[PDB]
Structures are given as structure tokens and as C-alpha cells.
Amino acid sequence: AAAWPRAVLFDLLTALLDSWTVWNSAAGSEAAGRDWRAEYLRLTYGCGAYQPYEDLVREAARNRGLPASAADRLEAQWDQLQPWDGARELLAALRPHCRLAVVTNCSERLGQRAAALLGVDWDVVVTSEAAGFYKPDPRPYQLALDRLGLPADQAAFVAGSGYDLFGTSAVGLRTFWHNRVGLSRPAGAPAAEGEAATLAPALPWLRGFAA
Ligand SMILES: [Cl-]
């Protein structure tokens, strides 16, 4: 007996799209791209209020000794961001049952372009620029719930970074962690409800959500 949530909120740039590959190509090396994207995630975590996405990506690059122009290579290769295997299949399988929303730490300009790569008519796309704060601040997630008119207990969150676990816990969003590259959980972060290296197990998890 199906028990779908009323909505599913998604992290975009780690849970649905393979940003790691594009950031590594822009960096010139897998090691530089790893340091760069790890520093970027820590900067958004400690930012709180929105500072331009482009400025934080550029600051993360300088902080780890990448050339500052790596940010400009990443913007030039933005259309190369590929959906993970199973991402488009998951979203299409949820469409008749749940409202679908993106909650992304990105500018409105690049966030909307990346959201469009999944070929889905998203009900809501919330960027940190529109929300005025970066996740894990509660505002971006709460803005997606307030736009849909739903309480958090009727919605699920699909995360790609363990930093989202701080925010989903605070808002009351039960979370499935699509942890493809096997990141560790940040210190002090609560465990996800479900966690897997692929997106396929998210569909049975969401189908049994209210059961
Ligand atoms: Cl690190």
C-alpha cells in the first residue's frame, strides 16, 4: 500500500547532478577539484546570509591555491553537468505522486540553468540567492515548504552532502542521503534516515514514507 510524502525536496548540485566531474575538469586535476569543492562546501556552511555564489566559488578556489580563473572555467562548462544515473528516472517516477522542489546553494541564474538539465517541470526551485541564506540555514528549506503550503512532516528531503543533515534536522525534514562518492558525515551532524551510494533505493524509501 503506497504511502508517498506530499512533496520531495532535493539538493541539486550533488544529489541529482555530477558536479564533481565538472569541477575536476575546471580545476585541471581531480585533487585540485576535490580540495576546491570541499572548501566551497565549508564556505557555504559558515556563510549564513547570502554572499554571491560566484564570489564564494572564486574564494574557495583561492583558499586552496587553484587559479582564480577556475570559477570562470566552471561557468563556461556549466551545460556539461550530467544527471547521475537514475536521477531523471527517479523524478519521473515521483511526478504523479509528489510535488517536486529543488533547494540549491547557487545563484538564481546558474541554479535555474542547472535545475533545467533534469527535464522536469519543478513545482518550486529555491536558490540561496532567492532565499537570502545558504543551506544548512533553515530558511531555504522552509521557503520551499511555505511555497508548497506544506508542513515538514509531509515532505522528504534527498541530500547529496552531509552538511544538509544539520538543516533538515532543524526544519524536521526526514532525509535520504544519496552519498555517491562516499563522503563522511560532518562532526556533530545527525544521521540521515536512509543512505546509499545510488539513487534507486530512494524510490522504495519514499513510497513507504508515511507507512
Ligand atoms: Cl577538507
Tab-separated table of C-alpha atoms and ligand atoms in Angstrom:
chain	number	residue	atom	x	y	z
A	1	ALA	CA	0.000	0.000	0.000
A	2	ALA	CA	1.624	3.274	-1.203
A	3	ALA	CA	2.429	5.960	1.403
A	4	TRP	CA	4.136	8.711	-0.600
A	5	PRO	CA	5.049	12.047	1.020
A	6	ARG	CA	3.196	15.158	-0.248
A	7	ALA	CA	6.493	16.603	-1.611
A	8	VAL	CA	10.160	15.686	-2.167
A	9	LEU	CA	12.784	18.487	-1.846
A	10	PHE	CA	16.151	17.862	-3.472
A	11	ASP	CA	19.719	19.026	-3.250
A	12	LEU	CA	20.544	19.744	-6.927
A	13	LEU	CA	24.312	20.048	-7.481
A	14	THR	CA	25.401	16.910	-5.535
A	15	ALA	CA	22.325	14.646	-5.202
A	16	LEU	CA	20.975	14.961	-8.781
A	17	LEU	CA	23.888	16.246	-10.932
A	18	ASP	CA	27.511	15.091	-11.061
A	19	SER	CA	29.202	18.414	-10.178
A	20	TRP	CA	32.423	16.595	-9.079
A	21	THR	CA	33.369	15.718	-12.659
A	22	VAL	CA	32.800	19.258	-13.966
A	23	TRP	CA	34.601	20.896	-11.004
A	24	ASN	CA	37.562	18.492	-11.586
A	25	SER	CA	37.653	19.355	-15.322
A	26	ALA	CA	37.510	23.102	-14.465
A	27	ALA	CA	40.233	22.673	-11.802
A	28	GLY	CA	42.652	20.908	-14.182
A	29	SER	CA	43.093	17.969	-11.733
A	30	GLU	CA	40.964	15.595	-9.619
A	31	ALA	CA	42.979	16.527	-6.471
A	32	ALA	CA	42.564	20.279	-7.040
A	33	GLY	CA	38.837	19.793	-7.812
A	34	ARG	CA	38.369	17.755	-4.618
A	35	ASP	CA	40.015	20.455	-2.450
A	36	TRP	CA	38.102	23.182	-4.248
A	37	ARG	CA	34.641	21.639	-3.895
A	38	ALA	CA	35.351	20.575	-0.247
A	39	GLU	CA	36.407	24.175	0.586
A	40	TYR	CA	33.323	25.565	-1.243
A	41	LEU	CA	31.004	23.342	0.858
A	42	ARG	CA	32.660	24.511	4.111
A	43	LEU	CA	32.344	28.187	2.979
A	44	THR	CA	28.586	27.900	2.277
A	45	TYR	CA	28.195	26.104	5.654
A	46	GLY	CA	29.734	29.006	7.553
A	47	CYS	CA	28.293	31.780	5.354
A	48	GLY	CA	24.753	32.054	6.716
A	49	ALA	CA	23.412	35.093	4.775
A	50	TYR	CA	23.814	35.049	1.019
A	51	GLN	CA	27.031	36.425	-0.460
A	52	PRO	CA	27.207	35.996	-4.297
A	53	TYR	CA	27.672	32.299	-5.307
A	54	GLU	CA	30.335	33.307	-7.896
A	55	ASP	CA	32.328	35.127	-5.171
A	56	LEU	CA	32.287	32.077	-2.817
A	57	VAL	CA	33.303	29.670	-5.639
A	58	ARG	CA	36.172	32.071	-6.505
A	59	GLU	CA	37.119	32.455	-2.792
A	60	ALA	CA	37.112	28.631	-2.334
A	61	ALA	CA	39.455	28.333	-5.383
A	62	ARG	CA	41.963	30.950	-3.982
A	63	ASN	CA	41.761	29.401	-0.461
A	64	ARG	CA	43.076	26.091	-1.904
A	65	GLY	CA	45.662	27.505	-4.342
A	66	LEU	CA	43.694	26.889	-7.535
A	67	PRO	CA	43.954	29.743	-10.138
A	68	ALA	CA	41.019	32.186	-9.582
A	69	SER	CA	40.013	31.610	-13.297
A	70	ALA	CA	38.881	28.030	-12.343
A	71	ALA	CA	35.490	29.645	-11.401
A	72	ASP	CA	35.247	31.034	-14.978
A	73	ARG	CA	36.083	27.621	-16.469
A	74	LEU	CA	33.352	26.064	-14.290
A	75	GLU	CA	30.778	28.668	-15.515
A	76	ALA	CA	31.841	28.022	-19.152
A	77	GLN	CA	31.347	24.224	-18.675
A	78	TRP	CA	28.018	24.612	-16.748
A	79	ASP	CA	25.957	22.909	-19.515
A	80	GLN	CA	28.220	19.792	-19.135
A	81	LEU	CA	26.709	18.960	-15.639
A	82	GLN	CA	25.245	15.469	-16.109
A	83	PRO	CA	22.351	13.933	-14.192
A	84	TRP	CA	23.508	10.946	-12.134
A	85	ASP	CA	22.306	7.508	-13.352
A	86	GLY	CA	18.748	7.091	-12.052
A	87	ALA	CA	18.131	10.850	-11.343
A	88	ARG	CA	15.769	11.553	-14.258
A	89	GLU	CA	14.126	8.091	-13.713
A	90	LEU	CA	13.552	8.851	-10.016
A	91	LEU	CA	11.983	12.303	-10.684
A	92	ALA	CA	9.690	10.930	-13.429
A	93	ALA	CA	8.541	8.062	-11.107
A	94	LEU	CA	7.698	10.584	-8.328
A	95	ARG	CA	5.861	13.107	-10.606
A	96	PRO	CA	2.298	11.576	-10.363
A	97	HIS	CA	2.595	11.256	-6.519
A	98	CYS	CA	4.600	14.173	-5.043
A	99	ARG	CA	5.224	17.867	-5.597
A	100	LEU	CA	8.925	18.217	-6.590
A	101	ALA	CA	11.200	21.026	-5.400
A	102	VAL	CA	14.847	21.999	-5.667
A	103	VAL	CA	16.623	23.644	-2.725
A	104	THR	CA	20.073	24.671	-4.019
A	105	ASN	CA	23.033	26.732	-2.825
A	106	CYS	CA	23.595	28.545	-6.066
A	107	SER	CA	22.831	31.920	-7.681
A	108	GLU	CA	19.353	32.332	-9.219
A	109	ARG	CA	20.938	32.474	-12.717
A	110	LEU	CA	23.100	29.290	-12.517
A	111	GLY	CA	20.693	27.450	-10.167
A	112	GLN	CA	17.756	27.752	-12.617
A	113	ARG	CA	20.001	26.636	-15.551
A	114	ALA	CA	21.176	23.547	-13.615
A	115	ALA	CA	17.601	22.776	-12.416
A	116	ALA	CA	16.520	22.736	-16.113
A	117	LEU	CA	19.020	19.987	-17.050
A	118	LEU	CA	16.777	17.295	-15.464
A	119	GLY	CA	13.856	17.830	-17.930
A	120	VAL	CA	11.247	18.161	-15.163
A	121	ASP	CA	8.600	20.793	-14.593
A	122	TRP	CA	9.735	21.523	-10.999
A	123	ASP	CA	6.895	22.776	-8.777
A	124	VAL	CA	9.388	25.021	-6.906
A	125	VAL	CA	13.094	25.964	-7.391
A	126	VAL	CA	14.579	27.736	-4.350
A	127	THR	CA	18.124	29.132	-4.630
A	128	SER	CA	20.186	30.555	-1.762
A	129	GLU	CA	20.139	33.897	-3.684
A	130	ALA	CA	16.289	33.980	-3.645
A	131	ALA	CA	16.167	32.744	-0.018
A	132	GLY	CA	18.844	35.221	1.147
A	133	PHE	CA	20.724	32.429	3.041
A	134	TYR	CA	22.777	29.336	2.250
A	135	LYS	CA	21.743	25.849	3.469
A	136	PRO	CA	22.009	24.492	6.250
A	137	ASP	CA	20.300	27.749	7.344
A	138	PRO	CA	16.598	26.741	7.819
A	139	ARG	CA	15.267	29.474	5.507
A	140	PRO	CA	15.884	27.887	2.014
A	141	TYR	CA	14.159	24.600	3.018
A	142	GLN	CA	11.340	26.472	4.833
A	143	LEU	CA	10.769	28.756	1.798
A	144	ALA	CA	10.251	25.637	-0.404
A	145	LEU	CA	7.745	24.217	2.185
A	146	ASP	CA	5.951	27.576	2.593
A	147	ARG	CA	5.644	27.940	-1.211
A	148	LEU	CA	4.061	24.451	-1.431
A	149	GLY	CA	1.834	25.136	1.643
A	150	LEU	CA	3.097	22.012	3.441
A	151	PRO	CA	4.365	21.187	6.929
A	152	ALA	CA	7.808	19.477	7.039
A	153	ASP	CA	6.334	16.167	8.362
A	154	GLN	CA	4.564	15.722	4.966
A	155	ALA	CA	7.780	16.211	2.939
A	156	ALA	CA	11.046	14.300	2.406
A	157	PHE	CA	14.491	15.675	1.549
A	158	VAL	CA	17.066	13.956	-0.710
A	159	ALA	CA	20.570	15.198	0.227
A	160	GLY	CA	23.942	14.836	-1.524
A	161	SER	CA	26.195	16.494	1.147
A	162	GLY	CA	26.246	15.681	4.854
A	163	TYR	CA	26.064	19.428	5.644
A	164	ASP	CA	22.338	19.343	4.657
A	165	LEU	CA	21.755	16.974	7.618
A	166	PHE	CA	22.161	19.933	10.020
A	167	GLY	CA	19.418	21.894	8.200
A	168	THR	CA	16.922	19.090	7.526
A	169	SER	CA	17.108	18.067	11.239
A	170	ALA	CA	16.332	21.693	12.314
A	171	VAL	CA	13.371	22.007	9.878
A	172	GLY	CA	12.003	18.495	10.586
A	173	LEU	CA	12.651	17.015	7.116
A	174	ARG	CA	13.250	13.234	7.028
A	175	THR	CA	16.271	12.723	4.743
A	176	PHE	CA	17.621	10.175	2.280
A	177	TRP	CA	21.361	10.749	1.576
A	178	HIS	CA	22.415	9.928	-1.974
A	179	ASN	CA	26.098	9.756	-0.985
A	180	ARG	CA	27.587	8.670	-4.343
A	181	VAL	CA	31.265	9.485	-3.651
A	182	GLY	CA	31.121	8.173	-0.050
A	183	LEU	CA	31.593	11.398	1.936
A	184	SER	CA	31.824	11.107	5.716
A	185	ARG	CA	29.153	12.670	7.914
A	186	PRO	CA	30.440	16.069	9.268
A	187	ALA	CA	31.202	16.062	13.032
A	188	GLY	CA	28.051	16.701	15.089
A	189	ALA	CA	25.644	16.074	12.164
A	190	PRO	CA	22.750	13.661	12.894
A	191	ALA	CA	22.492	10.513	10.774
A	192	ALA	CA	20.303	10.548	7.677
A	193	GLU	CA	17.122	8.380	7.808
A	194	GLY	CA	18.368	6.435	4.748
A	195	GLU	CA	21.751	6.470	2.930
A	196	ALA	CA	23.052	4.753	-0.230
A	197	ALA	CA	25.733	5.102	-2.948
A	198	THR	CA	22.925	5.200	-5.657
A	199	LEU	CA	19.569	6.983	-6.164
A	200	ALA	CA	17.491	3.857	-6.954
A	201	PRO	CA	16.819	2.979	-3.267
A	202	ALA	CA	15.243	6.471	-2.759
A	203	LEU	CA	12.056	5.414	-4.656
A	204	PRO	CA	11.003	2.481	-2.297
A	205	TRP	CA	12.032	4.706	0.673
A	206	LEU	CA	9.685	7.483	-0.488
A	207	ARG	CA	6.872	5.001	-1.402
A	208	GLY	CA	6.912	3.778	2.252
A	209	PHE	CA	7.371	7.290	3.737
A	210	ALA	CA	4.084	7.579	5.749
A	211	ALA	CA	3.577	3.813	6.330
B	1	CL	CL	38.848	19.222	3.598
